[PDB]
């Protein structure tokens, strides 16, 4: 059995589904039933969390974390990894057929793992956690960074890596949880951590800040005061006042067995405080989702491009897509109602799937649409809701479950059946279950109907 | 990857764990967390039901039924089948690692499927349902019988079979849901159906009946009247007064590609009204669990032996293990409190795993112990509870979840780690979930502690 999706999906993956630059109305279909490819816990109080999912052209890759005790405890953890294909069922829609499983269970607490689809298998970037995250940021040396390659021929290889730029500049670095991407002989993962303010990187970027403004809901104050507050928001005392920074782990695939990879650090003039994220490749255009862990509560998606120069002088440029639609839940001064620059470590991972390009060869598409699963609360991780969103407003909403259902991380991927033109979106959501532990991670497949 | 369990379990499978014939105390451990090998539905109202599971010495086989609509809806169904191995984790206990998946999704409503572990794979016995079960029994011709072979080399073969004895004798025949067994070049599945009263088989067995009596809770009445009622209980008007009859589907494995198999029908002097069941092979001794679909509410386990004379006149002999411990839920006159012969189609599938032999070369072990999952109610499928039971009384109880949790079918298998002597029992239970459809089939693995 080849590691190849059904042919009707191969040319409908990682494509912009709506290329009209025109206005559209949307209807989200009912969940389509199949045997879930994501295993639940087998105990009422075991922790199962942190999904990472990538649908590649020929196969998909998936991973999440399993703890025998509650989520907050951190002695031991295990990492479930699987790869598989899309297969059409007689019910009229595809199912995710698992072809290989790896359960990393060796006493190493691999955490925040991000998965990527690579030729003949999967690649996974983790860090080994031995202490509290706050202890990581208070420290002076990053935790162990691991790169795991899992192939269809049942070969599994794992290496400790020390990417160029890490040592001397960072207190800590972890993967971005959201999936990475394989693109032009490069393996690219999202990452984030704490930069030592007095280091080389810290000094160069000391004055960098980005302050998005919702013109419909502006923050009160003079420009200079708001800018100073936005700059200070990058150094939360919760993380020992390090500069919390997003970054990209970039590895040369042709040297994947020996390279140490390299950290490509964006300018903080173009991005908010470091956080979880996801790297997408759609129509050969790279995008970066950034979790709204900082004060800005709206959905963060950037158009990004890399400049690769021979000797570790790689750079990345990012261009914020101006989105003002819905807010993510947060605590205290960092709820979905706050739009003012303050020191925030809050929010929740809720990534989007863009249905349309934003920047194209002809210009900029104001009729931008994206879809995903949100949490309908300004303060609480509750009420999972499927949505399609425009730049400024929501187009359609479809709750999952009853009001009051607790839920957390969500990651969404859409693809098209080029046989019958069906548009499918899978909404992978951490959902609170009455019988298994914190979060049955449920992959909800729906058909998306698009009209004028 | 070979289709072989971790070596520390191979000599601890299908063995009697307690062979001293002595009294013992038991403690059921907490559920051990792992990624469940049994997938849930992906919709809040999709049906996922009817588990069948076999752990063989080198690998396990599993299957269950998936319907896009609610369970009572009967238009379409699909059959999830998987095979895999036991792998020890760093958490100190094994997990079930799926190695192959088949999702039979072709518009044929395969139903009541029973699985068996066979060399290099699995064998599954289904019937194709096209109408109500009561319509099956009211009719005069049995539905299509299917045998599916699924091998580790990814070969899948399916055949329609017409076992010797079926045509002309049965209104209907379906598989017993509980797993079958591979034993002495024979593939043996449980089955049950409706025998035509006027047929050869119907006439030959017209006077056969079995009336078990609980010496601690007897039914009041004269022997002759109670015997007539027990005889009458085999012909429920719910199934059009056919003789409802258990049977065994026996296939020659070396001819499995061409043989039609044969029905081996036990005497109803030794068994109750036909029902779901399970065939076990422990210490090279065959056992038959029979669901208490009829008026008798206690756990039904028989010691069985076959006589093959290679002349299509094979026979089976059964010896009831007298168990009076706990009762299964039922409706109306067929609740767990009724012990009197009446026409019943009720109950629920709850199979046992015997920890001790009952009949042995030296004699009979009155210190017989078995374990499983019961439903703690005389009327309602609710309160799933793990138990260890003696012949007359329960030894230990451990509820799963909160009081009031709905649950249905349960199938239990125990095995031993011959490295550390740990005794593991997996209780596979249909549990009602708040987020997925009726019954997340959950495999709860526990360690069983046995003392004097
Ligand atoms: C570890 C933990 O407490 N688990 C909670 C979980 O807590 C939430 C935050 O954790 C996660 C998240 O957003 O779910 C999970 C992930 O493992 C974290 N990564 C790492 C490397 O540690 C990730 C990370 O912390 C962020 O991306 C920031 O870099 O976050 C948890 O960090 C957060 O803790 C709060 C704390 O409650 C609060 O008292 C303090 O003031 O600020 C902290 C930082 O915000 O709390 C989150 C929930 O509000 O949440 C789930 C429920 O969704 C619990 O059941 C888990 O046990
Ligand atoms: C099909 C259906 O109604 N599904 C119910 C489910 O119903 C229970 C009985 O069904 C099962 C069982 O025991 O769960 C399911 C299985 O698919 C059946 N097999 C076949 C081949 O049809 C099996 C079978 O019927 C028995 O083994 C007997 O041969 O039984 C269902 O048959 C039963 O129906 C009752 C009926 O409610 C009652 O009005 C009538 O007088 O007698 C019938 C026979 O007892 O009801 C069972 C539940 O009480 O039950 C679940 C809940 O556990 C529902 O959610 C499913 O939708
Ligand atoms: C398993 O698959 C992997 C990846 O497809 C194979 O990896 C490549 O194999 C060639 C051998 O000709 C190597 O020279 C390359 O360096 C490998 N690439 C990577 C990414 O490591 C591997 O050889 C296969 N192992 C087998 C067949 O046992
Ligand atoms: C790097 O990204 C930035 C966005 O942060 C790009 O700057 C924008 O360019 C467009 C079109 O040239 C202008 O309309 C915007 O006003 C610019 N924004 C800012 C803040 O300058 C920039 O062009 C990108 N650089 C490269 C080399 O591609
Ligand atoms: C896959 O495995 C099955 C079972 O091991 C093989 O089935 C055997 O094939 C030979 C055919 O040359 C027959 O003589 C045996 O009777 C078969 N056993 C059964 C139960 O069918 C099958 O050949 C294998 N298929 C492939 C493609 O290698
Ligand atoms: C077949 O099973 C029956 C039980 O239904 C056996 O009958 C029992 O036999 C033992 C020893 O011969 C007696 O102590 C019991 O009293 C018998 N019970 C009944 C109800 O008759 C029978 O022996 C078995 N036959 C064979 C050949 O093993
Ligand atoms: C970032 O913006 C500041 C002004 O806020 C400017 O002084 C600095 O040169 C910019 N750096 C980069 C790399 O854009
Ligand atoms: C949140 O739920 C409320 C129902 O109380 C509804 O009115 C509102 O539209 C929902 N908002 C979102 C963003 O889902
Ligand atoms: C079954 O028992 C009846 C008496 O109730 C007897 O006449 C008949 O011969 C017995 N048949 C068998 C096969 O045991
Ligand atoms: C059932 O639950 C009740 C608690 O209401 C308890 O008293 C009883 O022992 C339980 N029985 C079994 C068999 O679990």
Swiss-Prot record, chains A, B:
GO cellular component, one term: host cell plasma membrane
Complex and partners: Homotetramer; composed of disulfide-linked homodimers. Interacts with F protein trimer.
Membrane protein topology class: Single-pass type II membrane protein
Annotated domain remarks: The C-terminus (head domain) is involved in binding the cellular receptor.
Compartments in which it is found: Virion membrane; Host cell membrane
EC number, UniProt record: 3.2.1.18
Keywords of this entry: Disulfide bond, Glycoprotein, Hemagglutinin, Host cell membrane, Host membrane, Host-virus interaction, Hydrolase, Membrane, Signal-anchor, Transmembrane, Transmembrane helix, Viral attachment to host cell, Viral envelope protein, Virion, Virus entry into host cell
Molecular function terms, GO-annotated: exo-alpha-sialidase activity; host cell surface receptor binding
Name by which UniProt lists this protein: Hemagglutinin-neuraminidase
Effect noted on mutating residue 238 to A: Considerably reduces the cell-cell fusion mediated by HN and F proteins
Disulfide bonds: 47-71, 61-122, 113-126, 219-340, 251-261, 334-344, 414-425
BP-aspect Gene Ontology terms: symbiont entry into host cell; virion attachment to host cell
Role this protein plays: Attaches the virus to alpha-2,3-linked sialic acid-containing cell receptors and thereby initiating infection. Binding of HN protein to the receptor induces a conformational change that allows the F protein to trigger virion/cell membranes fusion. Binds to the glycan motifs sialyl Lewis (SLe) and GM2 ganglioside (GM2-glycan). Neuraminidase activity ensures the efficient spread of the virus by dissociating the mature virions from the neuraminic acid containing glycoproteins.
Virion surface side: 1-451
Domain of life: Viruses
Glycosylation sites: 153, 198, 269, 317, 376
Keyword field contains GTP-binding: no
Catalytic reaction equation(s): Hydrolysis of alpha-(2->3)-, alpha-(2->6)-, alpha-(2->8)- glycosidic linkages of terminal sialic acid residues in oligosaccharides, glycoproteins, glycolipids, colominic acid and synthetic substrates
Predominant place of localization: virion
Site (Binding to the glycan motifs of the host receptor): 49, 111, 133, 192, 238, 276, 291, 381, 409
Broad class of enzyme this protein falls into: hydrolase
Family per record: Belongs to the paramyxoviruses hemagglutinin-neuraminidase family.
